[PDB]
Amino acid sequence: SMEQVAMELRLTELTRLLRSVLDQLQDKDPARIFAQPVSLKEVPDYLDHIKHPMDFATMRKRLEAQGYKNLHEFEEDFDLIIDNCMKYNARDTVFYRAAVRLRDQGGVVLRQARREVDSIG
């Protein structure tokens, strides 16, 4: 149908905007701490601690399959990255501290994203 196409164009355009959002958030992680999945070879107990692992590469795979229906879904995955880190790692660690800085800096990007998503519809 023509309606299904229009819906698909909307999804494609959301994917475009979320790709730019993802790039801007990942720039706030210049150490690449959150770039890839925590390695279960190197942290064998990880899934005993963290039930839903997340990282920027995993988000990018979902994004490119147009697997984010709305900004809320995308933010859920970004918050997982941060929240998983802040539980597994202690306050006095470079990992925890990286997550705090990512959260604080990402907030600004996500605030305007929400306005753009609502504005453009």
UniProtKB/Swiss-Prot annotation:
It is found in: Nucleus; Chromosome. Highly expressed in testis. Residues 9-113 form the Bromo domain. There is a cross-link at K41 (Glycyl lysine isopeptide (Lys-Gly) (interchain with G-Cter in SUMO2)). Component of some HBO1 complex composed of KAT7/HBO1, MEAF6, ING4 and BRD1/BRPF2. Component of the MOZ/MORF complex composed at least of ING5, KAT6A, KAT6B, MEAF6 and one of BRPF1, BRD1/BRPF2 and BRPF3. Interacts (via PHD-type zinc finger domain) with unmodified histone H3. Interacts (via PWWP domain) with dimethylated and trimethylated 'Lys-79' on histone H3. Scaffold subunit of various histone acetyltransferase (HAT) complexes, such as the MOZ/MORF and HBO1 complexes, that acts as a regulator of hematopoiesis. Plays a key role in HBO1 complex by directing KAT7/HBO1 specificity towards histone H3 'Lys-14' acetylation (H3K14ac), thereby promoting erythroid differentiation. This is Bromodomain-containing protein 1. It comes from Homo sapiens. The chain holds residues 555 to 674 of 1058 of the full protein.
